[PDB]
């Protein structure tokens, strides 16, 4: 692809977010760099309105899958770099199990030398004393598989995955990510076969930073060219691994007899 050639070498990156969660208004800025050749993304973020009113780990996935390493044999499945430099709109709804949700809408595009990610986030229905507003998430991150499916009729992708957020008391708070990406231009774009991005992250703090902040390191590699693939029930839209769709449907069809 054409966009593809833009990602040899280190690209500077800039992130901006305006958020509103349960009324709480906030802003975050970030910058660093992405290096698709390794799959490596490094970024530092500052809440510029002061104290972030949600835990930093819940914003990790919100804060550029164009930086994934696609291996030679899968380079024709890389939708993200193909939509470059005009970019793509990334939209999500993220559902925090037994708590609220975020809806996000982002434009990821080149502005001259830098890849920018600008995000608007709206969060509702959170519990004042849940894991999110009560700040009960540990400050760490795990590894996930990000499952990608083409959406020809939108000329883009449907992407689904579940985030495992560790909680201070030892439990795990789940966050189901329902994502889609659409090109901003009318340039042609690679529409991929089912695959996944293998994602690993580490969060830290800059010890000479007293502002509320996150340093994030991400490693991302495309793989998987399936019973683990996270798919949506065509009845109720819930995501689940492919292996479970048949037994889920047997029950779900009977539950929603009018559909």
């Amino acid at each position: 692809s054409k966009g593809e050639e833009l990602f040899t070498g280190v690209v500077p990156i800039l992130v901006e977010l305006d958020g509103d969660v349960n009324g709480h208004k906030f802003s975050v800025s970030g910058e660093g760099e992405g290096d698709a050749t390794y799959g490596k993304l490094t970024l530092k973020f500052i809440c510029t309105t002061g104290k972030l009113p949600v835990p930093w780990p819940t914003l990790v996935t919100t804060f550029v899958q164009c930086f994934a390493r696609y291996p030679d044999h899968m380079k024709q499945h890389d939708f993200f770099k193909s939509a470059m430099p005009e970019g793509y709109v990334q939209e999500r709804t993220i559902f925090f199990k037994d708590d609220g949700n975020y809806k996000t809408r982002a434009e990821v595009k080149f502005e001259g030398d830098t890849l920018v990610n600008r995000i608007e986030l709206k969060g509702i229905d959170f519990k004042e004393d849940g894991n999110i507003l009560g700040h009960k998430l540990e400050y760490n991150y795990n590894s996930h598989n990000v499952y990608i499916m083409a959406d020809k009729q939108k000329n883009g992708i449907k992407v689904n995955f579940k985030i495992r957020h560790n909680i201070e008391d030892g439990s795990v708070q789940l966050a189901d990510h329902y994502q889609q990406n659409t090109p901003i231009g009318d340039g042609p774009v690679l529409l991929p076969d089912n695959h996944y991005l293998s994602t690993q992250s580490a969060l830290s703090k800059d010890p000479n930073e007293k502002r509320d902040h996150m340093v994030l390191l991400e490693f991302v590699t495309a793989a998987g060219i399936s019973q683990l693939h996270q798919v949506q029930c065509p009845v109720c839209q819930q995501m689940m691994p492919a292996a479970h769709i048949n037994s889920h449907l047997d029950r779900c069809l009977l539950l929603h007899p009018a559909g």
């Binding site: 020809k152 798919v231 109720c236 048949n246």
Partner: protein, 76 residues
């Protein structure tokens, strides 16, 4: 008339049908283009499962409707 059938493998098949067609015939046409045996096919439209012995119009399926195909290895 043309309709689409969307798979979970991110794939869209377009199909040639008449509203008089039975589900079983539609499944046969699917087998004819993709090689998938009719008994591994479950077809879903606006949240309902399509039954053998009924027709595309029994479910008020029109031109350009999108169906959802889910495969079921055995037990189908």
């Amino acid at each position: 008339m043309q309709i689409f059938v969307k798979t979970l493998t991110g794939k869209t098949i377009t199909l040639e049908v008449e509203p008089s067609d039975t589900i079983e015939n539609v499944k046969a046409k699917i087998q004819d283009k993709e090689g998938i045996p009719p008994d591994q096919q479950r077809l879903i439209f606006a949240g309902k499962q399509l039954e053998d012995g009924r027709t595309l119009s029994d479910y008020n399926i029109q031109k350009e409707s999108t169906l959802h195909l889910v495969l079921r290895l055995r037990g189908g």
